Design a protein around this ligand. Structure first.
Ligand SMILES: [Ca+2]
Ligand SMILES: [Cl-]
Ligand SMILES: [Cl-]
Ligand SMILES: [Cl-]
Ligand SMILES: [Cl-]
Ligand SMILES: [Mn+2]
Ligand SMILES: [Mn+2]
Ligand SMILES: [Mn+2]
Ligand SMILES: [Mn+2]
Lengths: 355, 354, 359, 359
């Protein structure tokens, strides 16, 4: 349904940064800098530019003060300056609204193209960026919970197959998905950089941003984030986890920022860079697909997500999913999940796992 | 109201082993050897004797085939042979039924006393045991989920202050407990060996054995047990966790064996060996007391536990707790918990967290 | 010196496998399977095919019985079948000997090109491979020392800049190097897959193979390998480490197989996939460049490496390095190393760090 | 030849704290607080009082400014106030100099006894101490290299059996030792608290203090301390390690403070609280006894140690060891070590393991 342009797709390297609108810059600074330990590349009264421990581009996260908390831009770095031209022609062919600024939208980025994409998301494509001191060996700064890289974005959208075809045309390769036996797709993960993903589509009402994810080196670094949150008596801002994912095989944690923006901490997925990387499809009723240990997924994880803005800074209208709901079919009143396919023992009827 | 005997208490070193009755020995062997990686000290068609990586006594766990799954004995090692005689005099004065076997009840244990204690639990006291190869440097045998020591037992009993005073008289020192402002005690942790505990009392219907706990070296060893259970498609046997405890500060996991005996995997609690070790009391409504990260405690954790046997091998009758229920006051319809004391944000009412 | 062909370079994905010749197959199997825990894809009386925990191609290591222990092939996977044709044309233009086998040189590989490259190394390029069960979530098999991926090769060659230019034309990008203030390059690291490297050049007499490297998930996995070697009373086969590298920032260990092939265990380097990834140059006299903690580099690490074979299976003759020796200028008799640039305190004159001298 | 007193020994709980004299209080503070992350209980211009993450007594380390860097006191906590009286009666019957202060020698300690013991060391015994906030759940403060407990002291003394007999009479139980086949003892480890040790004797010229040891939770915490020292460009202050010990089975690191006082970081030894805990005796020529991975022990580890003070604050005279030297018999020019007992393969003669000789 989204047509494949004649124009060549831009060569996209990876997810690079997100710009998030926040309502209280000081509260958000405390969360991202004092709790999570992200490093400040630049800040003033209106914005905070933050980067992970191993990054050399200017930033991985921009917090911009504004009236309505929302995603303003999800940015991907492209391989060459000429790929920004290619992006612009590609989205024009798709009949999408675009805006190009030779000196960038945010500090530390040069020539950049922002677009309202066919799923209603604000994508940015850029090459030029101000290099900063790469802190990868600054063990004098290293926190027990250190965030080392930006890993991926996750987007909520009502029609996953529609979105998947579009991202595949753009060069993303699907690595894992969740489907049922009746032709419904609930989620898909897709990559450029050779990890399990750079973005993912989660079926639900949208456009909304589900989360932004950062990596740590080791599993104990994620445990430390939880332990620190207990010590600060903000354990209520731990939403889900820590756990092992089924899809992706990564160790994970979901926490909530002061404006409820969801942040995932993630580590130790696998290499997907080969072009015949085997795709893995999970059944939606498999209770090890999201948490490998079978821990229940809290309904807020399925229902809550962040608003996204269009290029004028207004919130995008939400379009309702009409396909089956992953919440309803697994943990709702008529839901079902299994531990072992075909075994009644360890299955759950009309409720979540573990009691 | 259990009287302190005039006879001197035995000098208890530590928790040493449990004897669990299991209904299918082969299934049980799979779980404890093939899944959990415990080391075989002896086996035959009726029993399997198992030890942890760093143990030098004969075993930490005896699995005995029997008709009804139950705890048969929770055993403590005493300091000297003469302490077995002390234990016998002590429990006799308490009015308890005792049985002394000079050659032991199980293989690899010598002179031993088993008793039906004042709380209805089958306790064993022994000194003599057959030493075996201590495997602590056998990294050729080390598993990614390696269980390295036996850490503690946890007992369900209806009146916590009654049992606590009894265990204090026996020389156990309380390290942590959970109470409310009305003065109810819901749980207590107490030690001999200088860790947070050797045994613990959980308020509930009893006597029942809540769990036996083994320790690992590191947190990732516990993660691996979860990951392995996923791969074996037995994730339904993960009951609760993994988590960080409030009480004890240990990283933890609870899993269920084939007869629904609960095993805890545990690491990185703190030193309690000083006699004035500060005792920590948590409020029952504090949602970080059990899981520090505020994860909810599943009802089964409060309501399910193993039967225990008397010295004839019959199941001990159960006494209902009359004091307030921790389940009811925290996650029941009239329950509540808080993240920050006095703050409605982050509080849960008639509802568990998350 | 090595000219850039007009013919386009093949699109190389990653290092994929090495074929090592071994003298006693059972002894080598004991090391790679029983000690290190690699997974057997296939074996017979002549060869063992092994893969890492997360691999889905047929193998990462082939062990082949032969009279003389040596590297027979270092293999790189290319993006498409047509890239194997490109590789053949590209190396033919370079004037190199090449051999094309439509059904592969080893089991589990299809159409494959082997070349004697301009530096004397036996490279293989292929696309087609038999997929196997990817064991990445088989935690029922996971070892305390589990090797999860093949990471890189490291090659000993006398003229590092000559080889560096050749690999750059082939599309490898240099991520780090070691140089001095007098124009000498002692080593360079270069990648295709977006980690610090897929291969590396170490200055010395060559061609010889320095090592093949496998990665683990965490640092404790590497510690466990050491601990297990102690328990098996083969700690004499731990050559160097464990440590933190300066170059690459990875945690590491070097061990020696039964034929003295060196294997590295490696974890937690950083992302290099951006095309303007900053290139890091370390000075050869910086005592934190190889081991970040300043631990001395044992002389065998600089002097010993494996023979490599030509396409006929004969050993390649060794060409002597005439550029300065990293060993000699850092830990030799007239050597020098520093902890802090410009500070005499924490410097070493004519011996290694931490109170040691060359044996 | 130290007789067993008729007076009963005090009941000793554990090692509790050390008082180290340091020459520059600010530079020592940088090391212990800014580099190592210890927690300040009290400080002024003359002294800094430091504790570990899980401690509830007032301190584990007192840094006292003075002209000559040295150990001033190694303190053990006793079980009851009455045990301080017992310590006094015990050491008086041994004919040792004692000094008793009802209000303590350092802040946060009450009634305390210091003695110049039969081996020349300044021991303190106390019960009373000021309790402080136990930081064990303060994960808002927890550093990547967090030191969680004080674990042990290690003493250099010329005659190990003489010292060991005396400590056994004091209630310490030997867990491990190192000996040769001709009856020389090189080192012994001994405990009260149910870990491998609270103190240890290392054969050498003495009295000198070899080190004080702190524990971490996990192995990666020790790795971080090394990594941080590299980042701070003070890797020259990493003396030995990191490694796995043979004796004790603990993961370890040795670093040097600004006055060259040696600090060990240590984790994951085993339980010794049972009274028949099996001893382990290692052969001095076993190259896995100190480092299980066979890494060489730097000569400074055998030769260098801190001065100790008498009760007047003057340095104790040093007595030379007449028994054989562990350095000499293992890594010296006539030394040897083995990987496998009886096997020439993996053995080292007249040099250290891994390819080094003494610097
Ligand atoms: Ca020069
Ligand atoms: Cl998920
Ligand atoms: Cl709990
Ligand atoms: Cl290196
Ligand atoms: Cl040692
Ligand atoms: Mn995610
Ligand atoms: Mn427990
Ligand atoms: Mn390497
Ligand atoms: Mn020590």
């Amino acid at each position: 349904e989204i047509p494949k342009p004649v124009a060549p797709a831009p060569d996209i390297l990876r997810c690079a940064y997100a710009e998030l609108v926040v309502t209280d810059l000081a509260k958000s600074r405390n969360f991202y800098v004092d709790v999570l330990g992200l490093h400040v590349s630049y800040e003033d009264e209106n914005q905070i530019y933050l980067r992970s421990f191993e990054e050399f581009i200017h930033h991985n996260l921009v917090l911009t003060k504004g009236p309505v908390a929302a995603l303003k831009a999800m940015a991907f770095r492209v391989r060459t300056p000429e790929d920004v031209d290619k992006a612009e022609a590609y989205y024009q062919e798709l009949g999408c609204r675009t805006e190009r600024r030779k000196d960038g939208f945010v500090k530390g980025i040069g020539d950049a193209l922002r677009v309202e994409d066919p799923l209603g998301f604000p994508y940015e494509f850029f090459f030029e960026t101000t290099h900063v001191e790469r802190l990868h060996m600054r063990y004098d700064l290293y926190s027990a919970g250190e965030l080392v890289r930006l890993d991926h974005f996750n987007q909520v959208t009502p029609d996953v197959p529609r979105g998947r075809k579009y991202l595949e045309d753009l060069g993303f390769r699907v690595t894992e998905d969740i489907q049922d036996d009746e032709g419904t797709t609930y989620a898909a993960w897709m990559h450029r950089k050779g990890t399990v993903h750079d973005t993912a589509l989660t079926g639900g009402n949208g456009p909304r941003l589900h989360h932004v994810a950062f990596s740590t080196h080791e599993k104990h670094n994620i445990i430390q984030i939880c332990d620190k949150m207990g010590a600060l008596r903000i354990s209520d801002r731990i939403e889900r986890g820590p756990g092992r994912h089924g899809v992706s095989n990564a160790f994970y944690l979901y926490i909530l920022d002061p404006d409820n923006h969801r942040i995932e901490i993630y580590t130790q997925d696998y290499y997907t860079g080969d072009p015949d990387n085997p795709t893995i499809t999970w059944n939606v009723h498999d209770n090890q697909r999201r948490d490998w240990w079978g821990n229940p997924v809290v309904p807020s994880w399925y229902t809550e997500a962040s608003k996204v803005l269009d290029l004028d800074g207004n919130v995008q209208e939400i379009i309702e999913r009409t396909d089956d709901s992953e919440l309803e079919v697994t943990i709702g009143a008529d839901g079902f999940s299994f531990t072992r396919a075909g075994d009644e023992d360890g299955s759950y009827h009309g409720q979540a796992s573990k009691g």
